[PDB]
Design a protein around this ligand. Structure first.
Ligand SMILES: *[C@@H]1O[C@H](CO[C@H]2O[C@@H](C)[C@@H](O)[C@@H](O)[C@@H]2O)[C@@H](O[C@@H]2O[C@H](CO)[C@@H](O[C@@H]3O[C@H](CO[C@H]4O[C@H](CO)[C@@H](O)[C@H](O[C@@H]5O[C@H](CO)[C@@H](O[C@@H]6O[C@H](CO)[C@H](O)[C@H](O)[C@H]6O)[C@H](O)[C@H]5NC(C)=O)[C@@H]4O)[C@@H](O)[C@H](O[C@H]4O[C@H](CO)[C@@H](O)[C@H](O)[C@@H]4O[C@@H]4O[C@H](CO)[C@@H](O)[C@H](O)[C@H]4NC(C)=O)[C@@H]3O)[C@H](O)[C@H]2NC(C)=O)[C@H](O)[C@H]1NC(C)=O
Ligand SMILES: *[C@@H]1O[C@H](CO[C@@H]2O[C@@H](C)[C@@H](O)[C@@H](O)[C@@H]2O)[C@@H](O[C@@H]2O[C@H](CO)[C@@H](O[C@@H]3O[C@H](CO[C@H]4O[C@H](CO)[C@@H](O)[C@H](O)[C@@H]4O[C@@H]4O[C@H](CO)[C@@H](O)[C@H](O)[C@H]4NC(C)=O)[C@@H](O)[C@H](O[C@H]4O[C@H](CO)[C@@H](O)[C@H](O)[C@@H]4O)[C@@H]3O)[C@H](O)[C@H]2NC(C)=O)[C@H](O)[C@H]1NC(C)=O
Lengths: 207, 206
């Protein structure tokens, strides 16, 4: 019957005390004969009652959709306390228990490196700026680009890729006009991760 | 049961010596009704090229019947549509799956190689970067080489949609720092249909 999907807090939310991380328990495919949905939240097996469940909203294919949000602490997620969403519906045989938490392993300090555009690409109107981050663990990390103190708009970040040593890596490309690079403009790659001290480090890139 | 249809690998379609093939995977087959039949259609015209691989009983007490359809190199590159028709007693109606190559004019990939970061030269192993962008569709294969021998210590990111509509990716080759500083020449091999003869390569060295 109903399908339960659990979404972890975003990487930036847990790493910054200003932001508020949340775990989302989305349930879809809810029929009208059994529309009521009940959520049970557990933290390391201990039930909590500080969640906020919103009323069911009917979708466009004759089914409802219910979302339950549990607020988590910054250190609790960084300590990896598992969060279990137990969804109970009268059409289900047994309540569905979905569990998610931080990736099991040892936090390794990320290594951020920046690469200038290739000399062959200098003949084009568009050049590529490369930010290489390697050796970080777990895979939840934030990569951003800014210049002159303001963020850049047209940049892309590749998904993390697991290496052979048990750590992840990814690439970030910022494409700017060749005139901007030749004028010695400073482009920086901001990286936020759990292993980083204060969860922040930065490297500058320029001609 | 469920029907999964998969396209051929990019390298197979670009080399005549290779054998591109379309794979139709059927899962969720019950033991009571294990009879599975395959019908293949190429642009409406039926082809009888169904050769069923040996089945596989999984860890949930079901089967995984896989059918392989080898297609011509030029036929796939022309945008022809291939249909996999699967019939089973547990299915109320036969399931038809049709897949084809992404439509649109091919764009020539632009191959660029990046030397390892100067700050990264403090590690025992460095990483070589090969940037391939501006190609279409996303089907592409990247391989490494050095003095005529493949370099099998690399990872490659999946193609990523770009702002202009093309695709880009990065290939990271991890080698010994000593080898890079000795002047060795490493080649980044790219196989895309838009390229003439479906092949090009850019060499990277110190
Ligand atoms: C009982 O079990 C069976 C099988 O038993 C095993 O199940 C697995 C999961 C194990 O856990 C194990 O316990 C059991 O032994 C069950 O069937 C399984 O069901 C899984 C879902 O629960 C399913 O998961 C899929 O994962 C895909 C991720 O891709 C990666 O994983 C598999 C391999 O693990 C491969 O797809 C990829 O590897 C491929 O594998 C091939 C091996 O050679 C190669 O492909 C072809 O090889 C040829 C060889 O010559 C040619 O080269 C050809 O060109 C190749 O294409 C290839 O080499 C290799 N590649 C690599 C890199 O290794 C890959 O590793 C995922 O993509 C699947 O697709 C789904 O995913 C979503 C799931 O939420 C779904 O929502 C999506 O919609 C998506 O479907 C499609 O998405 C498209 C996106 O746009 C849509 O366009 C499309 O329309 C849509 N499809 C439809 C119909 O709408 C999927 O998640 C497992 O793959 C499957 N098991 C196996 C072995 O395949 C079964 O459920 C159970 N039965 C019951 C119960 O009855
Ligand atoms: C009836 O309609 C239902 C609702 O669909 C709506 O109506 C239709 C007509 C269209 O208009 C839709 O656009 C519309 O949404 C259907 O429910 C859907 O079922 C599918 C099952 O195949 C669900 O797919 C799942 O998607 C996960 C991604 O999560 C995003 O999915 C939606 C993408 O469209 C999006 O709407 C969701 O909001 C969700 O967005 C995320 O929200 C979290 C909230 O915290 C954010 O943090 C994220 O950043 C958001 N991400 C994005 C991309 O927006 C998939 O990930 C998942 O696959 C994999 O999930 C995990 C990993 O995440 C794996 O472990 C797992 O094994 C699996 O491989 C899954 O496929 C889809 O989400 C459902 N729709 C909604 C709104 O929930 C019904 O299927 C349909 N029924 C029928 C009979 O037609």
């Amino acid at each position: 019957g109903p399908s339960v999907f659990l979404f972890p807090p975003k990487p930036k939310d847990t790493l910054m005390i200003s932001r508020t991380p949340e775990v989302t328990c989305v349930v879809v495919d809810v029929s009208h004969e059994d529309p009521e949905v009940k959520f049970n939240w557990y933290v390391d097996g201990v039930e909590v009652h500080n969640a906020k469940t919103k009323p069911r909203e009917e979708q466009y294919n004759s089914t409802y959709r219910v979302v339950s949000v549990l607020t988590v602490l910054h250190q609790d997620w960084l300590n990896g306390k598992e969060y279990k969403c137990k969804v109970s519906n009268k059409a289900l045989p047994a309540p569905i228990e979905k569990t998610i938490s931080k990736a099991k392993g040892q936090p390794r300090e990320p290594q951020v490196y920046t690469l200038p555009p290739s000399r062959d690409e200098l003949t084009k109107n568009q050049v590529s700026l490369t930010c290489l981050v390697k050796g970080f663990y777990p895979s939840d990390i934030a990569v951003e680009w800014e210049s002159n103190g303001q963020p850049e708009n047209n940049y892309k970040t590749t998904p993390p890729v697991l290496d052979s040593d048990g750590s992840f890596f990814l690439y970030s490309k910022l494409t700017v006009d060749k005139s901007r690079w030749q004028q010695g403009n400073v482009f920086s790659c901001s990286v936020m991760h759990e292993a980083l001290h204060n969860h922040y480090t930065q490297k500058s890139l320029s001609l």
